[PDB]
Amino acid sequence: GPGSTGASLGMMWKDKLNAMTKEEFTRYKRAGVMETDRKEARDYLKRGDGKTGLSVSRGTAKLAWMEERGYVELTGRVVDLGCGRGGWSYYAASRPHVMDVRAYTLGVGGHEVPRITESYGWNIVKFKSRVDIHTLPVERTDVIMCDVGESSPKWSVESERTIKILELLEKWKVKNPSADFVVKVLCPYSVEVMERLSVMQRKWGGGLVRNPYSRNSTHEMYFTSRAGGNIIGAVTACTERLLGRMARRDGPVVVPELNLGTGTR
Ligand SMILES: C[S@@+](CC[C@H](N)C(=O)[O-])C[C@H]1O[C@@H](n2cnc3c(N)ncnc32)[C@H](O)[C@@H]1O
């Protein structure tokens, strides 16, 4: 495929997601998706028992899966652009080769607020809320982490939002050319995103990965420093599966939550 084939396929997927009923959507959303079980975690969150190693969100697992399979090498200083509740930050912290973790996010108008918790490594985590990552002055880092991307029914909106994030990586990577990156690509199937993505690969290496834990309702993929392959091929593969799961009626694949344990480093 040239890239336009990839593009119109994702757009087919989008139209088919939007045309669903609430019934079909809620079913499809989770069908065959890996799902961390939050029964216990939700209780600690509702109660506010910050003395827990359990994940503050479902981002932790996503990051775990990325890292255990080796699409990123979390070492040294780890900047977490757009950290919401801190699920990635708290994961990054629990990891041996990781020194300092700067977590940034808004946490402002119904936006996820960093959750304070005694998960293993919290002392080397430093949150800042009321922060706009796009204007946060570039600092030196070993790892650039960015899980940002507000979904939308309009793919061109989704792609627009994805591009600002790709330019955010470039900026942060021009000062830190040798650092690892895991970067959300909310709309990898659009024509603009694909061309920027391959240009960035040409410059920085890395590639696209689809996370099992991502819901079928989002087409999100991750651009990481240690993966590789054809980008168009990777997105198309992803679109192919997401389209096929529309006949999937079964539930999610439920897996236990991550426990990072309680403690300091
Ligand atoms: C998907 S969440 C992060 C998930 C996180 N790693 C976790 O596991 O909890 C991304 C967060 O970035 C925030 N965000 C979006 N745009 C931002 C911006 N311009 N500046 C700072 N934060 C932003 C959103 O509020 C959102 O909560």
Side-chain angles (χ1 to χ4, degrees):
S4 85
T5 303
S8 50
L9 265 184
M11 292 162 66
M12 268 201 62
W13 171 79
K14 198 66 174 190
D15 306 330
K16 278 182 171 187
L17 185 70
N18 284 340
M20 277 184 166
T21 337
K22 295 174 183 179
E23 286 82 57
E24 300 154 340
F25 180 85
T26 297
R27 254 221 225 102
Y28 176 68
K29 186 170 88 150
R30 282 175 177 187
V33 180
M34 299 267 252
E35 260 217 332
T36 218
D37 198 302
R38 314 219 84 236
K39 286 172 79 180
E40 276 197 6
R42 294 162 185 274
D43 283 314
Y44 285 94
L45 294 171
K46 193 180 180 180
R47 199 197 299 104
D49 195 315
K51 200 183 172 188
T52 325
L54 293 176
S55 304
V56 294
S57 71
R58 7 184 63 100
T60 313
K62 297 180 80 171
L63 227 210
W65 185 90
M66 227 101 80
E67 263 101 39
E68 67 186 31
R69 220 138 278 91
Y71 307 112
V72 245
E73 279 291 277
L74 305 174
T75 307
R77 287 216 191 184
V78 174
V79 162
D80 191 9
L81 297 319
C83 72
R85 287 194 284 194
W88 281 26
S89 301
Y90 277 120
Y91 181 80
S94 66
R95 302 279 254 147
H97 293 269
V98 181
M99 301 207 85
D100 202 293
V101 178
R102 290 102 102 204
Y104 298 86
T105 188
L106 295 161
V108 173
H111 276 232
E112 321 277 7
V113 172
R115 302 226 150 150
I116 275 77
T117 280
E118 288 182 319
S119 171
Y120 185 73
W122 61 271
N123 57 133
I124 37 136
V125 178
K126 193 79 180 290
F127 301 107
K128 289 271 199 197
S129 315
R130 306 186 304 150
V131 181
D132 177 23
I133 50 168
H134 296 93
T135 55
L136 193 276
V138 191
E139 301 167 1
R140 74 209 173 192
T141 328
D142 293 312
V143 188
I144 308 170
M145 260 156 42
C146 181
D147 200 0
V148 172
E150 186 180 312
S151 91
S152 152
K154 290 210 277 163
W155 67 258
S156 61
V157 164
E158 300 193 314
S159 68
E160 274 161 44
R161 310 225 259 240
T162 304
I163 280 170
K164 288 184 179 181
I165 284 157
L166 290 164
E167 303 167 333
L168 210 227
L169 214 210
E170 180 81 5
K171 200 170 79 179
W172 267 87
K173 189 89 157 123
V174 171
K175 291 281 181 180
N176 309 312
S178 28
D180 273 24
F181 58 85
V182 232
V183 172
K184 194 163 135 184
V185 191
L186 173 86
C187 192
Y189 56 81
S190 92
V191 206
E192 294 181 327
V193 169
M194 265 167 176
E195 259 143 303
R196 217 97 164 123
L197 226 313
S198 60
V199 164
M200 264 172 73
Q201 186 180 230
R202 181 197 272 252
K203 209 187 168 190
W204 305 119
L208 279 198
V209 153
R210 173 66 179 192
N211 205 103
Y213 296 91
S214 293
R215 263 104 160 270
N216 301 331
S217 44
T218 168
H219 206 298
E220 83 201 346
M221 295 176 82
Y222 290 83
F223 182 31
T224 64
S225 70
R226 294 294 172 93
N230 189 286
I231 288 166
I232 284 156
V235 186
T236 310
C238 184
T239 313
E240 276 161 354
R241 290 189 76 186
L242 286 186
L243 287 157
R245 287 186 169 190
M246 300 199 160
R248 271 251 219 182
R249 299 201 171 220
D250 64 309
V253 182
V254 188
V255 160
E257 251 290 36
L258 284 180
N259 203 310
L260 299 165
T262 315
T264 77
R265 287 262 302 301

